[PDB]
Write a protein that binds this ligand. Structure first.
Ligand SMILES: CCCCCCCCCCCC[N+](C)(C)[O-]
Length: 257
């Protein structure tokens, strides 16, 4: 399909490919894109199939599809980029670093989906394995409580009112998410590029222990995990940590350029 793709800035320090999460879109990352451009990076943004300004039934895609999109972006750029992904997008960039290990300069994962939420019952995981096979196009609610996204009430309100944000997830995408969560841990030793993981300690959408386990599972030496005490799933707009969170990402990318 014809996706929504956009390039921002001049890639004096290289490229950073931005990979958004489930139900959102790349337009929510204007602040980070501006900061990265200001530091000398180009940013390549896209909206997943079924998300944002891209076409397709809402929420109907897969982690594998996103990785193929990343393949295409790296072919277009003609050089190794950094990857930045959040939530579903954080899981995706970790899986990309595992399955295309020599194609990137490094990977930054914000709240990557590496552990099941306690709000997601175990039978829902088993159901997704079935529905992903027999009714892959079936569209269901993602179960997300927006109040769990951020300690910033205005950020939560914006998310709710954003017309590009949706709560759909297909059977195919649900199956892909839980399957790739498992594989992300099993294949952790395949990563060769430097890694930065960023988590909020109060995140129950993607429990931080998933990142903590991954950090220990990684074999690459240049690995870093940063915790933000009290932050929810989205640290970007957190009142206490939003600015620091942005700064850590930029500083890490600058130091690895
Ligand atoms: C498809 C069968 C039922 C699937 C619905 C279960 C909800 C899955 C929530 C996925 C959340 C992944 N996330 C947002 C943390 O990245």
């Amino acid at each position: 399909m014809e996706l929504y793709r956009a390039k921002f800035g001049t890639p004096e320090r290289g490229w950073v490919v931005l990979v958004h999460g489930l139900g959102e879109h790349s337009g929510r990352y204007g602040k980070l894109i501006e900061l990265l451009n200001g530091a000398g990076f180009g940013v390549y943004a896209f909206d997943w199939p079924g998300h944002g300004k891209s076409p397709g039934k809402r929420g109907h895609t897969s982690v594998e599809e996103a990785m193929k999109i990343i393949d295409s972006i790296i072919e277009e750029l003609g050089e190794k980029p950094f990857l930045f992904g959040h939530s579903l997008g954080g899981l995706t960039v970790i899986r990309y670093a595992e399955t295309r290990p020599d194609k990137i300069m490094g990977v930054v994962a914000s709240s990557p989906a590496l552990a099941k939420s306690p709000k997601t019952p175990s039978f829902m995981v088993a159901l997704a394995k079935v529905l992903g096979r027999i009714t892959p196009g079936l569209s269901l609610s993602n179960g997300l409580d927006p109040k769990l996204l951020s300690r910033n009430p205005d950020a939560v309100k914006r998310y709710i009112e954003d017309p590009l944000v949706h709560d759909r997830i297909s059977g195919k995408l649900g199956m892909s998410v839980f399957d790739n969560m498992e594989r992300a841990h099993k294949e952790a030793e395949r990563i060769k590029a430097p890694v930065l993981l960023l988590v909020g300690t109060a995140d129950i959408i993607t429990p931080p222990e998933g990142s903590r386990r991954l950090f220990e599972e990684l074999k690459v030496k240049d690995k870093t995990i940063m915790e933000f005490k009290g932050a929810y799933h989205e640290i970007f707009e957190d009142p206490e940590w939003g600015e620091e969170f942005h700064r850590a990402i930029v500083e890490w990318l600058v130091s690895h350029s």
